[PDB]
Amino acid sequence: RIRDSLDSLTREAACLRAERKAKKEMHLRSQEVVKHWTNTYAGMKEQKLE
Amino acid sequence: EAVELELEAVIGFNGHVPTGLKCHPDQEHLVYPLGCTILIQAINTQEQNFLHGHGNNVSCVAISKSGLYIASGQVTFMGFKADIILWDYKKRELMARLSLHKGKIEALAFSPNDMYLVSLGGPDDGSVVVWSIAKREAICGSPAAGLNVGNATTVIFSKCRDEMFVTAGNGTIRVWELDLPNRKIWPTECQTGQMKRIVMSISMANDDSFFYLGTTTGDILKMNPRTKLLADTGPAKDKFSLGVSAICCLKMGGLLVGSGDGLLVFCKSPSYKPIKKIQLQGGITSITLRGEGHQFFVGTEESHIYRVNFTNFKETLITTCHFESVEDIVFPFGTAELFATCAKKDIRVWHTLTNRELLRITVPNMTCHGIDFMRDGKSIISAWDDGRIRAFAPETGRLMYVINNAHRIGVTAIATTSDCKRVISGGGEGEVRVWHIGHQTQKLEEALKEHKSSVSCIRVKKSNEECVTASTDGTCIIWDLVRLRRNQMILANTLFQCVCYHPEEFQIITSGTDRKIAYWEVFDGSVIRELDGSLSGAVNGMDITVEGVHFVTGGNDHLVKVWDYNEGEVTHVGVGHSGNITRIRISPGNQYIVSVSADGAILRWKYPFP
Amino acid sequence: PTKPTAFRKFYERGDFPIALEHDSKGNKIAWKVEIEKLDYHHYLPLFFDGLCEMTFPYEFFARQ
Amino acid sequence: EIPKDDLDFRLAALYNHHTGTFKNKSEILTHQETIQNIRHWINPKKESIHSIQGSIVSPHTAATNGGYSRKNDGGFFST
Amino acid sequence: MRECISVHVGQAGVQIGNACWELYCLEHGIQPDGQMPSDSFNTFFSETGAGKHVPRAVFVDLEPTVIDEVRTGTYRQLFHPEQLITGKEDAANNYARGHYTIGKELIDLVLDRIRKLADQCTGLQGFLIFHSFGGGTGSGFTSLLMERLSVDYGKKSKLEFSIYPAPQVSTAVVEPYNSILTTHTTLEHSDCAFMVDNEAIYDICRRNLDIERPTYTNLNRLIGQIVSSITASLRFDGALNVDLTEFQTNLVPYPRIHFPLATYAPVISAEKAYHEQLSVAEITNACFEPANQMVKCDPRHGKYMACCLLYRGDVVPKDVNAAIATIKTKRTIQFVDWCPTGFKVGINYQPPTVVPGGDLAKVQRAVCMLSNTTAIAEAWARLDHKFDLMYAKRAFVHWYVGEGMEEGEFSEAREDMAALEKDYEEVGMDS
Numbered sequence A: 001r002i003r004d005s006l007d008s009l010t011r012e013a014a015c016l017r018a019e020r021k022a023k024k025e026m027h028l029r030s031q032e033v034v035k036h037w038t039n040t041y042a043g044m045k046e047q048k049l050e
Numbered sequence B: 001e002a003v004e005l006e007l008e009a010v011i012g013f014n015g016h017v018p019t020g021l022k023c024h025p026d027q028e029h030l031v032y033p034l035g036c037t038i039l040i041q042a043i044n045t046q047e048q049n050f051l052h053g054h055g056n057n058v059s060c061v062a063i064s065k066s067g068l069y070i071a072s073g074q075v076t077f078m079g080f081k082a083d084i085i086l087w088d089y090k091k092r093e094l095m096a097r098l099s100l101h102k103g104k105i106e107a108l109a110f111s112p113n114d115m116y117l118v119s120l121g122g123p124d125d126g127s128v129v130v131w132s133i134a135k136r137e138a139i140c141g142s143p144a145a146g147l148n149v150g151n152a153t154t155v156i157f158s159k160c161r162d163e164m165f166v167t168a169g170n171g172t173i174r175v176w177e178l179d180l181p182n183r184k185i186w187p188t189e190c191q192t193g194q195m196k197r198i199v200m201s202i203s204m205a206n207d208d209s210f211f212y213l214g215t216t217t218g219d220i221l222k223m224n225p226r227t228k229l230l231a232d233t234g235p236a237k238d239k240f241s242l243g244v245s246a247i248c249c250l251k252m253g254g255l256l257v258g259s260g261d262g263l264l265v266f267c268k269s270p271s272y273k274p275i276k277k278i279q280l281q282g283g284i285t286s287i288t289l290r291g292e293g294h295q296f297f298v299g300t301e302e303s304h305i306y307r308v309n310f311t312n313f314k315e316t317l318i319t320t321c322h323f324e325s326v327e328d329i330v331f332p333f334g335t336a337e338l339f340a341t342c343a344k345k346d347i348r349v350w351h352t353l354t355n356r357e358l359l360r361i362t363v364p365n366m367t368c369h370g371i372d373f374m375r376d377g378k379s380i381i382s383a384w385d386d387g388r389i390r391a392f393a394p395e396t397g398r399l400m401y402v403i404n405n406a407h408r409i410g411v412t413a414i415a416t417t418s419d420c421k422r423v424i425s426g427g428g429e430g431e432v433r434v435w436h437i438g439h440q441t442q443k444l445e446e447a448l449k450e451h452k453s454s455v456s457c458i459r460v461k462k463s464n465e466e467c468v469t470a471s472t473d474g475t476c477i478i479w480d481l482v483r484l485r486r487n488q489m490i491l492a493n494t495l496f497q498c499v500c501y502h503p504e505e506f507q508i509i510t511s512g513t514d515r516k517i518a519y520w521e522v523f524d525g526s527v528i529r530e531l532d533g534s535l536s537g538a539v540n541g542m543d544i545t546v547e548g549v550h551f552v553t554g555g556n557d558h559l560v561k562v563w564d565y566n567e568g569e570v571t572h573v574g575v576g577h578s579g580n581i582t583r584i585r586i587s588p589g590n591q592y593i594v595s596v597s598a599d600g601a602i603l604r605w606k607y608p609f610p
Numbered sequence C: 001p002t003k004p005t006a007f008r009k010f011y012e013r014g015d016f017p018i019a020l021e022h023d024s025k026g027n028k029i030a031w032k033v034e035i036e037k038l039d040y041h042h043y044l045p046l047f048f049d050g051l052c053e054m055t056f057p058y059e060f061f062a063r064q
Numbered sequence D: 001e002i003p004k005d006d007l008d009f010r011l012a013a014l015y016n017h018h019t020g021t022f023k024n025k026s027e028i029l030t031h032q033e034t035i036q037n038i039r040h041w042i043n044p045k046k047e048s049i050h051s052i053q054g055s056i057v058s059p060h061t062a063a064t065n066g067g068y069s070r071k072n073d074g075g076f077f078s079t
Numbered sequence E: 001m002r003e004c005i006s007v008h009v010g011q012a013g014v015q016i017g018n019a020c021w022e023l024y025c026l027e028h029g030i031q032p033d034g035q036m037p038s039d040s041f042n043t044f045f046s047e048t049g050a051g052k053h054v055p056r057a058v059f060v061d062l063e064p065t066v067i068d069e070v071r072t073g074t075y076r077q078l079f080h081p082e083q084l085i086t087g088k089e090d091a092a093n094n095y096a097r098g099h100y101t102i103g104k105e106l107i108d109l110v111l112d113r114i115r116k117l118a119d120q121c122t123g124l125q126g127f128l129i130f131h132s133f134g135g136g137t138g139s140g141f142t143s144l145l146m147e148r149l150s151v152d153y154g155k156k157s158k159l160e161f162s163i164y165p166a167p168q169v170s171t172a173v174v175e176p177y178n179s180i181l182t183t184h185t186t187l188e189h190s191d192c193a194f195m196v197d198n199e200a201i202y203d204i205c206r207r208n209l210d211i212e213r214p215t216y217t218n219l220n221r222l223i224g225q226i227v228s229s230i231t232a233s234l235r236f237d238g239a240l241n242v243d244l245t246e247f248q249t250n251l252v253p254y255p256r257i258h259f260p261l262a263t264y265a266p267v268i269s270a271e272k273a274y275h276e277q278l279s280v281a282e283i284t285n286a287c288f289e290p291a292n293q294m295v296k297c298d299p300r301h302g303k304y305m306a307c308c309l310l311y312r313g314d315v316v317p318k319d320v321n322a323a324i325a326t327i328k329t330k331r332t333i334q335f336v337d338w339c340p341t342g343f344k345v346g347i348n349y350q351p352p353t354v355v356p357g358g359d360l361a362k363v364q365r366a367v368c369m370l371s372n373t374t375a376i377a378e379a380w381a382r383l384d385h386k387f388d389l390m391y392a393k394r395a396f397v398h399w400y401v402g403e404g405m406e407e408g409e410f411s412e413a414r415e416d417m418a419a420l421e422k423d424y425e426e427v428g429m430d431s
């Protein structure tokens, strides 16, 4: 416990960094699925502009 | 668009109203009602032509003697009409809609020459009308209820094709004679000496000599329609226990009596003595006799159809189902052969393929709301309206535990964590509660009181970490598990019924009353798109398979809908029952789709590829 | 090993004119009847029989 | 099982001396090896709907209240 | 090892104890049949070698209708089958049926069970009676009981958590007859008397808590929590521990002013606990408002004479001292010359427990207080006016002289209350 006490702050920072990265990556992959969907309002506006 | 899949395995029954079961005189097919329709079953279980209509619940069935016409009444709101429908038995076509009463229709009957039908209607506005079949209209009618007596229940014609009997609801017994040229029916009353019974069933002999009445007091009354006087009293010394509910005749003079406490007795006219008695399951309300004579059928109030041989009186149950509004099927994980179906006072564990019932567990008179399995096969949890959460052993129905004062109102939705340690409950109060189980005791950790209204469904992530609470407030919360606080709220314009996760957990999908199947972004509660329901119904049950390309949707009309996931592709095979479908699940083997219709009917179709 | 005593049976019937108050200076056996004219042919060879009990409420009554 | 003649004549004689009258020897000694759905569970205490104690639910559907009872001196009263 | 005996006489007593005796089952691990799954239980439950724990409480009613709810309900395996003494016919709002001819039958049985329980406790510390002023058996059976119990045992302490009739609302007709007669008993053969009423718990149940339609199963749980706060130091550990004479000596100055009020400080819902900070300084200050009295009077128009407190939970005494100094600084709260301290604090090291289905949140800090105040003489004035307005025309007195009670004891308890109301102001005046 005392040997690993010297690095207590780095794991605390690493967990926040990992959770923020995973959340934002989930947002981006769901945006990929949303942009591949076809019955959206703005996508229908783009097809009407076409 | 809207390709019809296939249809199989009708399960339910309505035996709650009298004389619903009537075999037609070719003695092969049995017709019987259901929540809003009629059903015809063969010997091969060929469900045939659910005959559509009536707008609301069918309540009374009468069959023409030749075997070509069937006519069934129904029940509507106060001051609304109610329609007899004449059907066929060859090409199952709505011939005549005969809609002339007030409120509802209590009784229908046919004449032995096929020209005439008779109808009794009204709990308050009671009248009898006579219909002709040559032209789908009424001949004449009159109040079929004795003023300064009470009301009336049932009617039957003679075999003189002209005189018909209206039967005591509280002590009015009246013969009418019908004459065509005056176009009239004449009321005479059968005077009885000191007897005033509450008559509650009726049958007629073959040669019109005597007709029999079963009363609530338990004694069988024989009548004489020629003398217009009381003919014979009933038994002294062991009158039947409850009211006499189901009387049938034979070609000879041996009447078959049945009482609503579940008793069947062979009976004869001078001495009403039980020559052959068999105690059955639940209150009998229908006897129907095959025209060959030697086998017959019994319909019971608890929905059991009994094929019973006339020789030696041995029975064989052939159809069983629930007898109130059903809710919340759940498959076991890994097994596609088992069903759990829960309803008022009752839980049943089924089979899937051969449709046998394997076990049944009763709470006495309270109401169930939700059922769920464990992640393993150890226990089945259920949420009841008595303010309690129970859990039961899988076989032998042992009660492992109960939870005394869970919520303030009845606990509605219940959910299982995949590590078999935690159970999440939500109820009508809104105090969302978490239960840690153990071998010895079970305890509560923290009460999450976001909501202001009821809770519909609770569904948790594949690896527990987050959950979601579908609720009828307009807010669907995602909670986290490892800490007890809230992440995100869906605020929307729909009283929610079903909220499902996408496989691979990208998005979450909501439905409800406002008929907008809506996909939702898993962050911020940001709405993506809205795909509409059928037309002006509602939707209560969604389903996604393991992969996440199929999407099953079931609701307030008769329509179950297969959908593609990414685009809106509909596939209708919802031609089944319009009793309001409330939950629907696919088998874990991706073979069958199973839906529970509220009026008790569990139907499975085959799997289509989306 | 101990044995069942008749002091216990006569107490569960309720024959003894005995009572207890746990007075703060010490537990005292309150007496509802005069001690000087008891029936010592009855009440000594049963208290002497209740000497043989180790469990709490009866050993105190026997001794005092 | 039998270790001798005594337990042969009495281990299984099946001959009441009181009741068997005017017998024979073979009728005395006679042992016995010469001679030779749907399942359900019911709750015990039939409960009552009327004798329940969780709450007294409001006459108005107070999710969207029907006759407005506010909390005395300002705010929501119910749930 | 520091035991207590708690009797529940009447109907209201038994129905409060039905809500008292699961809070004790939930504080410890005692599940309802009596088998703890996994000795701070000692004051309330004895233990028996098959694992089975048994209560220390007696339940009596002269009619069998209410005890037979318990006898086949959820707590039937818990109680011993002679802790449940029943009868056939009630007393029916008459004091004489209960304290006299028909009530002298079950007194030997209730005294046998008091003797048979009190003869097995190693250390005895006193009595907690739960008897209703409003009863016909709950106010006559107990007056028949206490006059014999205090002859038998004597010096041990008596605390009664009774139900005072509310000043406006009342649910019987001869309550001014049945209230006045039992205070010929409770002045001489009793040593404390905590009263509560029913209108103010409805008040505090709807204003501090979003309950529409409040009932008796809401009253009895809060009055169970009050007694579980007063019985905290005999069962747990903490900084300052107050025992069942260490407050009941603090609280009775004169031998006829022994009538103190009670107040429980944190009463709040499950939603709005997140929005209040819930500190020691504010839940000490909630105790001294006129809104939060469980007994319908204003303490401001009177004077607190002596007080007490019963803390719990996560407190440290610097906060309590800083609270008490502010309470002494304030001027809504007025005192007398003859008690310049006017305070008494106990502490404990345990939070409140949350019985499932209860409408309270898991607060950590918890306070009770128990006040000898002279402003209960106003409520006794309001029930004082009710008596002679019915004895003037001699109404209902045949129902009392029929079942063995002479007429003159109406005048005797009249001048008894007259002397008591003489005493309160004579000891509340300044010198």
Ligand SMILES: Nc1nc2c(ncn2[C@@H]2O[C@H](COP(=O)(O)OP(=O)(O)OP(=O)(O)O)[C@@H](O)[C@H]2O)c(=O)[nH]1
Residues within 6 Å of the ligand: E009, E010, E011, E012, E013, E015, E016, E063, E090, E091, E092, E093, E094, E132, E133, E134, E135, E136, E137, E138, E139, E163, E171, E198, E216, E217, E219, E220
């Ligand atoms: N807090 C509370 N008070 C109760 C409860 N039940 C009865 N009471 C009170 O009891 C008072 C009347 O006394 P009762 O208990 O009804 O009468 P009793 O003691 O049974 O005497 P009898 O009528 O002769 O049988 C009423 O004013 C009620 O306020 C209860 O469950 N909780």
Ligand SMILES: [Mg+2]
Residues within 6 Å of the ligand: E010, E011, E061, E063, E090, E137
């Ligand atoms: Mg009573």
